[PDB]
Amino acid sequence: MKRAVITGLGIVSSIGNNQQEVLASLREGRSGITFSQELKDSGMRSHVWGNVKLDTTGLIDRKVVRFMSDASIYAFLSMEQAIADAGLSPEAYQNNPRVGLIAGSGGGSPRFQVFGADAMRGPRGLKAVGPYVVTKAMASGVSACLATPFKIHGVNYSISSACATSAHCIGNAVEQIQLGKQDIVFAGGGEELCWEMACEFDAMGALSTKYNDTPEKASRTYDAHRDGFVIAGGGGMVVVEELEHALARGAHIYAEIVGYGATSDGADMVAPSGEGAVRCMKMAMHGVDTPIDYLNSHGTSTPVGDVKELAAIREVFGDKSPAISATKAMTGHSLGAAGVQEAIYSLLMLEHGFIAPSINIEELDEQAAGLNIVTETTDRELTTVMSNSFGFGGTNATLVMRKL
Amino acid sequence: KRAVITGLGIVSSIGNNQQEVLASLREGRSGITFSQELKDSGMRSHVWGNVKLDTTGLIDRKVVRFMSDASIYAFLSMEQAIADAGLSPEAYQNNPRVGLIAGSGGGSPRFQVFGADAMRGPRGLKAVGPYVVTKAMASGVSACLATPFKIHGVNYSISSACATSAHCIGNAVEQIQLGKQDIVFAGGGEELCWEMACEFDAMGALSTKYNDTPEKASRTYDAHRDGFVIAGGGGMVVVEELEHALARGAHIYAEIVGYGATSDGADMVAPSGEGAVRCMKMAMHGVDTPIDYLNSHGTSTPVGDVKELAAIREVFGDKSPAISATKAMTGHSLGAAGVQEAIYSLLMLEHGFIAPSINIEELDEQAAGLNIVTETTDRELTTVMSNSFGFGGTNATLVMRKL
Ligand SMILES: C=C/C=C/[C@@]1(C)SC(=O)C(C)=C1O
Ligand SMILES: C=C/C=C/[C@@]1(C)SC(=O)C(C)=C1O
């Protein structure tokens, strides 16, 4: 089996439009959460979100962007960044059977799905719909919209697994390398931000509703007064590359993907079982001869979910648990984009030797006792980092990344 | 490590189990009907491949409450596959070596739209209810099955438009090859609704000239084809590691001996041909038996049909296999097409026949020379190929061989 490394990255998020801006927000413990007039206007109870603060007008060519929803736009721009950051040029990655793309969203595009239906029911029907809704709204929008303009010839599909989507995308990319089928796979995803989708999470009571007057305090993972997650949008993309291929071209290598866990609860639809996560982390830690220095938790800021993961971490590690922070307290929950963005946050912490703070803990949950939850930015020489992604439907992903 | 198919299940326009499907295939029987729903919506295409089954009460209330139609069809298909594979609950449930990879092309446009419509009404959130997320999310098909079937292994959806459930099967094979799983349930489902259908109609992808004769609308390779006929349904196969299957005395349909997965990197909604050539060649690597039958993607589109035929010619030259497009009978079930057509191919393999490519009244001149079978033909088959090409230039091919 071949080894897989990360040789580039790109990110559009609530806390930065590139890796430099994101690095700055992580070290500062800056919140990306703002009041949303759009959410309030729709009749929602959650009025806060992790929005992308970027004018994307003119950033993608007219004939390319016409097929794209926001999830695709966010993923495309991240992919541009990742290509450049990897030091890759068209002659190397384009029209190359051994270079692929695995990237998805959790929701596709509810916005253009609803636009399509709204337009169809109006007096102009098909003519008001137009010819571009399928590529905007289909579940595989994110992969279809990137593989075509980037001239990808290798693998091309999307993995969806709700909150674990882009973490599974990365892990499947690793498998492509291990099987010797691909030299490079761009892995990640994107997620639009809109009332059309967010109202679905509000109607199940999943979103924070009590902190709308103080938007930066709404997302408060592990705080005893958390009341659900803060919904976010954005994209992320990493370049997953075979080790020898990377070394031979003098690539910059952030880390090796040394562990990939993928498991299922087989229990509850919208609540974590715990034992699924335990098995997932163990799978990711298998054969890894170094300790986990830092854990970027799934920790979405939900009453049951936050502490269920903690109980799982305690089971896996015991007394000697790693430093833990939940960056969703800063960023919000970008759903399908969460896995890659959080793999990137963890890689920036690995690369730059620090731990981002788990913010908005005004009163630590009684069930979080005895663990190392890092609440202020602390410089440390990290070697091996772990990222957890647990989604609706009991789907679990865990990534372990280590310096070479 | 080797992967075999040990069980199958299907809910399609041409049958609600493998026996009804078998009969439809041997008979060249159309599953296409007139749709008042598509007509009422303002569409130009008024034909569809509908599931002729009322699914009310077939799934536990507390389980089906989270599900859209795509998930319902896949679930029912999975029950059949479990039973067909002879797997007790103790064999496959609460088992880390047993997984599920199943997707849809579209998620649930119906419930995406319902949520937004409900929210804009006088009841807002209380009308939306707590179930729309699991229904509308892109991973609904996997999420809604993994849980009630007590799946402990892998649990996610591959999505790639028309190639969706084909990549699901191929990824399942990879899980076996890597030694991570002993069993993976692989397949997909797709709902059938104007919400999604009108999007395909608005880009001109759907057939519109044959609404008075619904059964003649889907007509792959016919000179007067005018687009595909939308369909819904589900499929599921049991992908199983060989030694595991042999040990428990499983009935094996075939081994998956080849899996191609490529990208066009060309056009969004038109195929390049080039990518399909590479996909089929990739599926044929190390396969030294001839292809006895090819189940084409063949959707009944002017450009698409002959683009795939050209790719077949380039791959096979003057050794081109027997070909039929079962979509002329079934319609195009999108995310469910890959697994359903693998199942049709598996049925032809098991029962020694070639299903007809129907409704060819005038063979396209670009299809001249080729062995497109238009009549049910009894034949001993050994090795079969099935193609799936989706929008976004995404390609999958599966090659299956009798043991
Ligand atoms: C099995 C379902 C997973 C549920 C989790 C823990 S995953 C998630 O994002 C949120 C908000 C939850 O409640
Ligand atoms: C990348 C474009 C693929 C297009 C194909 C061949 S895939 C498909 O289902 C239909 C109807 C087409 O026209």
From Swiss-Prot, chain A:
Changing residue 299 to S: In strain: MA-1 / fabB3. GO terms for cellular component: cytosol. Involved in the type II fatty acid elongation cycle. Catalyzes the elongation of a wide range of acyl-ACP by the addition of two carbons from malonyl-ACP to an acyl acceptor. Can also use unsaturated fatty acids. Catalyzes a key reaction in unsaturated fatty acid (UFA) synthesis, the elongation of the cis-3-decenoyl-ACP produced by FabA. Has an absolute requirement for an ACP substrate as the acyl donor, and no activity is detected when both substrates are based on CoA. It catalyses: a fatty acyl-[ACP] + malonyl-[ACP] + H(+) = a 3-oxoacyl-[ACP] + holo-[ACP] + CO2; (3Z)-decenoyl-[ACP] + malonyl-[ACP] + H(+) = 3-oxo-(5Z)-dodecenoyl-[ACP] + holo-[ACP] + CO2; hexanoyl-[ACP] + malonyl-[ACP] + H(+) = 3-oxooctanoyl-[ACP] + holo-[ACP] + CO2; octanoyl-[ACP] + malonyl-[ACP] + H(+) = 3-oxodecanoyl-[ACP] + holo-[ACP] + CO2. It comes from the Bacteria. It is an enzyme of class 2 (transferase). NCBIfam families: PRK07967.1. The keyword Acetylation does not apply. CDD domains: KAS_I_II (cd00834). Its EC number is 2.3.1.41. This is 3-oxoacyl-[acyl-carrier-protein] synthase 1. Induction: Mainly activated by FadR, but minor repression is also conferred by FabR. Pathway: Lipid metabolism; fatty acid biosynthesis. Belongs to the thiolase-like superfamily. Beta-ketoacyl-ACP synthases family. It is found in: Cytoplasm. Pfam families: ketoacyl-synt, Ketoacyl-synt_C. Keywords: Acyltransferase, Cytoplasm, Fatty acid biosynthesis, Fatty acid metabolism, Lipid biosynthesis, Lipid metabolism, Transferase. Residues 1-403 form the Ketosynthase family 3 (KS3) domain. GO terms for biological process: fatty acid biosynthetic process; monounsaturated fatty acid biosynthetic process. One of its GO terms (molecular function) is 3-oxoacyl-[acyl-carrier-protein] synthase activity. Transmembrane segments: none annotated. Changing residue 140 to F: In strain: K1060 / fabB5. Homodimer. The active site is at residues 163, 298, 333. PANTHER family: 3-OXOACYL-[ACYL-CARRIER-PROTEIN] SYNTHASE 1 (PTHR11712:SF306), POLYKETIDE SYNTHASE-RELATED (PTHR11712).
